[PDB]
Curated annotation (Swiss-Prot):
One GO CC term, this protein: basolateral plasma membrane
Result of altering D108V: Partially bound heme
Enzyme Commission code: 1.11.1.7
Keywords: Antibiotic, Antimicrobial, Calcium, Cleavage on pair of basic residues, Cytoplasm, Disulfide bond, Glycoprotein, Heme, Hydrogen peroxide, Iron, Metal-binding, Nitration, Oxidoreductase, Peroxidase, Phosphoprotein, Secreted, Signal
GO molecular function, one term: thiocyanate peroxidase activity
Expression across tissues: Mammary gland; milk.
Documented effect of changing E258Q: Decrease in activity
Cofactor or coenzyme needed: Ca(2+); heme b
Protein name: Lactoperoxidase
Residues of the full protein shown: 118 to 712 of 712
Native organism: Bos taurus
Function of the protein: Heme-containing oxidoreductase which catalyzes the conversion of thiocyanate (SCN(-)) into antimicrobial agent hypothiocyanous acid (OSCN(-)) in the presence of hydrogen peroxide (H2O2). Also involved in the conversion of iodide (I(-)) into hypoiodite (IO(-)) in the presence of H2O2. Responsible for the inactivation of a wide range of micro-organisms and hence, important component of defense mechanism. The lactoperoxidase-SCN(-)-H2O2 system shows antibacterial properties against some streptococci strains. The lactoperoxidase-I(-)-H2O2 system shows antibacterial properties against E.coli.
Length: 595
């Protein structure tokens, strides 16, 4: 029982032992088990998968088959009855900058990516799912319910294609289906450098011995760099404006261009790497290219790790931070550093923090131009608003001065995402991220809400009155019972996000526990954790201790007025200071005298 491993996908396993740098694929991090945490391997299962047929079919596939004796409600109905809301007033988080939401997506894209299966190169089946809404194989359409407005203007469904899974790609059946994580489980800046050697290399500027990352040769941000373009067709960034004809960017991670602020954040990171390669050159003229690239890579990965664990997680978890992530004790080679399947859903809480508009601010932090504020849906895969309309400085100001959307039980996901999401190769700004999250949760064979409450050592409500007490909300509990007919069937994504927020944090107790464990594990289980003895020098470590997101902005834009604490709500000019009164990153301890 339980033979140890299917392993047709990741075959090659060769580990240079001495190495001072992480591999791109994440392999060799764990010396006892070298493939743990590498990209392109199955997501970890913290609990056995739950499928309608116990093997691969998701719940909601066969009409007559129930879950625990009940039909599961359509993803879109749960979306319409619980997730939507009209009034965008008073929905803003008075105490989290918009940078808060953005950093979450960034970290998230470093950690996991379960892309759709691909049997659609020169195919009809791409359209057979779009055109006629016929379920079968990897096509698992999100049907609209009886009273849905999209029925009137969009057809019968919203297309959806099941997520990639390991050994095969169309058929297989003996063990439960396990989805693939295409990025490294380590918080290693794989989103800047890539998780594949093919991409990692392409991203590099291999024309000179400076260990720099390739930059855009066709457009400049007033002297500063832009991410190179991804010359590939069909490009969705060109699709949203065929006049501007501006391609999507090429980053270590596929999704970089999905929305303009992520693209922005990716730009800052790329610049910081290069800035780091240049200062290291000055101090170490002898270091070759590779060394420069790697030493810069290594520094940027630490940066991402510090900001995430010192600044970000404490304000996501609040009071629960300590219960799950106690002070670092060092590298424990016994810990599973893989990202769990459920984490990829639990981290989607960030979806309720996305606001309906985005702004561009000038040097006085006032409306940049006559259309400074734009609706969120006009920015999906929009790279021209950056290239042909002000570079990233105006947007980075918005990220600092604007607020994230506070999650709210009566106002969960803004319609910009819930009704107007754009998906590549599909042609309308008419998709629903909430519905997709739900369908996806079933596609991954996720256990119900209570299995996870049980997993986290929390009560498992079984009645209306039961759920009200946990959700601390009668009306929401009723709507959920009416739809699910048992809390045992509530999809973990929505059940987890419906819980009230723990003191000082921005997620409920279930999620705090799920997020808490995962982050504790990617930290304790990482051999290259920045604070782990032997990775950096004692002196380099005191220099790193000084990074701030503020500093990153000062060093990589033309902004000189920034707050001290980037993730909290900050107003200009009061909460802002001059970049000069801000700790820089002293790179002296990287100088290497050996003569
Ligand atoms: C405007 C901002 C955002 C947009 C437009 C967006 C859109 C999307 C879309 C289209 C997907 C894939 C759906 C699927 O195929 O299952 C996705 C997935 C996801 N999002 Fe977002 N998202 C945004 C922000 C965020 C934020 C702020 C966070 C975290 C705090 C986040 C966390 C995730 C996670 C974990 C996934 C699952 C990734 C995987 O496949 O492993 N997202 N998002
Ligand atoms: C698609 O992208 C087009 C290319 O940028 C964009 O057109 C550009 O955007 C506006 C639209 O008129 C113009 O900017 C405005 O502001 C400047 C201030 O300097 C003034 O010249 C005018 O008031 C002007 O309207 C750009 O001039 C314009 N450029 C071109 C070549 O058309 C479109 O608006 C975008 N279309 C969509 C559907 O997104
Ligand atoms: C790779 O780096 C090289 C060397 O820095 C780049 O070539 C230079 O680009 C500058 C602009 O910064 C131009 O003035 C010169 O043509 C080059 N200068 C030097 C000193 O070499 C090149 O653009 C980079 N290539 C890519 C694809 O990013
Ligand atoms: C805002 O959040 C921060 C934590 O990021 C905390 O120090 C503070 O108590 C909050 N401020 C207000 C005014 O609510
Ligand atoms: C190392 O990890 C294992 C599994 O998580 C745990 O049982 C053990 O207590 C850990 N030891 C230390 C010193 O962290
Ligand atoms: C680019 C793309 O495939 N879409 C996309 C997927 C996930 C996500 O979090 C943001 C965007
Ligand atoms: Ca990673």
């Amino acid at each position: 029982s339980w033979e140890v491993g299917c392993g047709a996908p990741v075959p090659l396993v060769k580990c240079d032992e001495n190495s001072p740098y992480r591999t791109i694929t994440g392999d060799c991090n764990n010396r006892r088990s070298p493939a743990l945490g590498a990209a392109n391997r199955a997501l970890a299962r913290w609990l056995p998968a739950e499928y309608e047929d116990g093997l691969a079919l998701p719940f909601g596939w066969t009409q007559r088959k129930t879950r625990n004796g009940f039909r599961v409600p359509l993803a879109r109905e749960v979306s319409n009855k619980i997730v939507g809301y009209l009034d965008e007033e008073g929905v803003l988080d008075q105490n989290r900058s918009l940078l808060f939401m953005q950093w979450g997506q960034i970290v998230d894209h470093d950690l996991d990516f379960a892309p759709e299966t691909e049997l659609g190169s020169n195919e009809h089946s791409k359209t057979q799912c779009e055109e006629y809404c016929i379920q079968g194989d990897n096509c698992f359409p999100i049907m609209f319910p009886k009273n849905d407005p999209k029925l009137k203007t969009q057809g019968k469904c919203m297309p959806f294609f099941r997520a990639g899974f390991v050994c095969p790609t169309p058929p297989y059946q003996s063990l439960a289906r396990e989805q693939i994580n295409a990025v490294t489980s380590f918080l290693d800046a794989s989103l800047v450098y890539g998780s594949e050697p093919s991409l990692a290399s392409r991203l590099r500027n291999l024309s000179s011995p400076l260990g720099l990352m390739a930059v855009n040769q066709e457009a400049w941000d007033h002297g500063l760099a832009y991410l190179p373009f991804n010359n590939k067709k069909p490009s969705p960034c060109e699709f949203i404006n065929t006049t501007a004809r501006v391609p999507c960017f090429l980053a270590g991670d596929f999704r970089a261009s999905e929305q303009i602020l992520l693209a922005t954040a990716h730009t800052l990171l790329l610049r910081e790497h290069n800035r780091l390669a240049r200062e290291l050159k000055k101090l170490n003229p002898h270091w070759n290219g590779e060394k420069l690239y790697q030493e810069a890579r290594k520094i940027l990965g630490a940066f991402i790790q510090i900001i995430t664990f010192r600044d970000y997680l404490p304000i996501v978890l609040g009071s629960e931070m300590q219960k799950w992530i106690p002070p670092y004790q060092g590298y424990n080679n016994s810990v599973d550093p893989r990202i769990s399947n459920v984490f990829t859903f639990a981290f989607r809480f960030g979806h309720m923090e996305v606001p309906s508009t985005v702004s561009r601010l000038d040097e006085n932090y006032q409306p940049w131009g006559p259309e400074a504020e734009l609706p969120l849906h006009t920015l999906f895969f929009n790279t021209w608003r950056i290239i042909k309309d002000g570079g990233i400085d105006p947007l980075v100001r918005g990220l600092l001065a604007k607020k994230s959307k506070l999650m709210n039980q009566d106002k969960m996901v803004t319609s910009e995402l819930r009704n107007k999401l754009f998906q590549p190769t599909h042609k309308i700004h008419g998709f629903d991220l909430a519905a997709i999250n739900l369908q996806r949760c079933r596609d991954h064979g996720m256990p119900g809400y209570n299995s996870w409450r049980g997993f986290c050592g929390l009560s498992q409500p079984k009645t209306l009155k039961g759920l009200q007490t946990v959700l601390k909300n009668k009306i929401l509990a009723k709507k959920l019972m009416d739809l699910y007919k048992t809390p045992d069937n509530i999809d973990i994504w929505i059940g987890g996000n419906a819980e009230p927020m723990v003191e000082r944090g921005r997620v409920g107790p279930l999620l705090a526990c799920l997020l808490g464990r995962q982050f504790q594990q990617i930290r304790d289980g990482d051999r290259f954790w920045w604070e782990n003895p032997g990775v950096f020098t004692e002196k380099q470590r005191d220099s790193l201790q000084k990074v701030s997101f503020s500093r990153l902005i000062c060093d990589n834009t033309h902004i000189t007025k920034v707050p001290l604490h980037a993730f909290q709500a900050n107003n200009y000019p009061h909460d802002f200071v001059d970049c000069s009164t801000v700790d820089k990153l002293d790179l002296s301890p990287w100088a290497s005298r050996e003569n």
